[PDB]
Design a binder for this molecule. Structure first.
Ligand SMILES: [Mg+2]
Ligand SMILES: [Mg+2]
Ligand SMILES: [Mg+2]
Ligand SMILES: [Mg+2]
Ligand SMILES: [Mg+2]
Ligand SMILES: [Mg+2]
Ligand SMILES: [Mg+2]
Ligand SMILES: [Mg+2]
Ligand SMILES: [Mg+2]
Lengths: 62, 109, 175
RNA sequence: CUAGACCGUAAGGUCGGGUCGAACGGCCUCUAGUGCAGAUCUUGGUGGUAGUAGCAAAUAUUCAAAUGAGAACUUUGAAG
């Protein structure tokens, strides 16, 4: 399948970069059926698409 | 003999990657592990667990460990098999040190 | 129909074709000549060994500045290669001609490649850009391949008067 | 088209055989945009070179799954 469009949609909906969009590898078909931002929103809601938290730039040494 | 068997190996990656170019040390480590499993189990088909790949690339492309403890499980190929009836599956073994360990046979049951 | 020169029985032969095939003509000529005349199953096993680099295709005409290999030994040559794309195309045609042969009713075990022929198909044109704003041709050299598989099958003397008399004389002084 | 035949010193002419499909000759004369190996000739087609020169700047890829006839290169995840 091709989920390149869904990851771009998920980045726009969630508000993060594409680098922060996690699509569940075990839900490829269900993600593929999600073609609208409304469907992406429901997938973010039920956790098929996750926000993939920021990698930390600690200041402790500084 | 027993076509399906699993064993514990430690591989000296230090001598196999000796002199190898820095940007290909980890990719060479992958190829040397596949060659290693092919030599030990006689299987052309070798599949590495992604966690083994993570172990190989832990210190980057240039910092492969000298020795790596591997669990090689020769199994029966299924799911619309390829040419070979058997394949080898390599996954890493969590040990504090990979030194002073001998080849041993793992009991599946 | 209408292949190159063939001298075989069409009743116990089958044939295959691939025209305008995007595969190197020089490589495919060598691959074809490598199995020309072989038994069909021997050639198909041999082509599989070529694919996995256990045996090589000897390169006999289009071979200037090829590398040297020990796998050319069995063919009396030093220059041999492993043209995977040609081998795939040939073994595809071998499969078709085999399918045709047992579709016609021919026996499998007696099949041998009686005729295999590679011809230059029309070239496909591209361009390559050169120093100082020059353009050169960048051409494919496609192949027409045809092959036929066949079942293996299992004066008065004028004498002069002297010669006739000598023969008669030998017969009356010999018994 | 034809290491098949015949005539002419020769330019050439004729015949057989194959291919082919709709027009074309002999002779007497008339007429010319009338005969090619060359012109770094024109246009077009094609070789040897040669499966050769090469496809080496921009640090770098790897494992698995999914898809598919086919995956170094597509997608997803993991990682660097
Ligand atoms: Mg050195
Ligand atoms: Mg060279
Ligand atoms: Mg160029
Ligand atoms: Mg001639
Ligand atoms: Mg007509
Ligand atoms: Mg003129
Ligand atoms: Mg001329
Ligand atoms: Mg002249
Ligand atoms: Mg080259």
């Amino acid at each position: 399948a091709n989920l390149r469009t869904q990851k771009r949609l998920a980045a726009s909906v969630v508000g993060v970069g594409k680098r922060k969009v996690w699509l569940d590898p075990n839900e490829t078909s269900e993600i593929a059926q999600a073609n609208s931002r409304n469907a992406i929103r429901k997938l973010v809601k039920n956790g098929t698409i996750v926000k993939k938290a920021v990698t930390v730039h600690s200041k402790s040494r500084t | 003999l027993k076509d399906v068997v699993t064993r514990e190996y430690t591989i000296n990656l230090h001598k196999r990657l000796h002199g190898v170019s820095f940007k290909k040390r980890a990719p060479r480590a992958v190829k040397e592990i596949k060659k290693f499993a092919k030599l030990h189990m006689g299987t052309d088909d070798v599949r590495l667990a992604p966690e083994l790949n993570q172990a190989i690339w832990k210190r980057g492309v240039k910092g492969v460990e000298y020795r790596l403890r591997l669990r090689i499980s020769r199994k029966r190929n299924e799911e619309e098999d390829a040419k070979n009836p058997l394949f080898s599956y390599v996954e890493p073994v969590l040990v504090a040190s990979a030194k002073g360990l001998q080849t041993v046979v793992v009991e599946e049951d | 129909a209408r292949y190159g020169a063939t001298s075989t029985n069409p009743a116990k032969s089958a044939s295959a074709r691939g025209s305008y095939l995007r595969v190197s003509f020089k490589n495919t000529r060598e691959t074809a000549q490598a199995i020309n005349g072989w038994e069909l199953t021997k050639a198909q096993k041999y082509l599989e060994q070529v694919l996995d680099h256990q045996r090589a295709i000897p390169f006999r005409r289009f071979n200037s500045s090829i590398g040297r290999t020990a796998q050319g030994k069995e063919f009396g040559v030093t220059k041999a290669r492993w043209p995977a794309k040609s081998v795939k195309f040939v073994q595809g045609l071998l499969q078709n001609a085999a399918a045709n042969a047992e579709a016609k009713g021919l026996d499998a075990t007696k099949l041998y490649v009686s005729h295999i022929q590679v011809n230059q198909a029309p070239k496909q044109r591209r361009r390559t850009y050169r120093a100082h704003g020059r353009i050169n041709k960048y051409e494919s050299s496609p192949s027409h391949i045809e092959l036929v598989v066949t079942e293996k099958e299992e004066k008065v003397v004028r004498l002069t008067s002297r010669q006739r008399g000598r023969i008669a004389a030998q017969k009356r002084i010999a018994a």
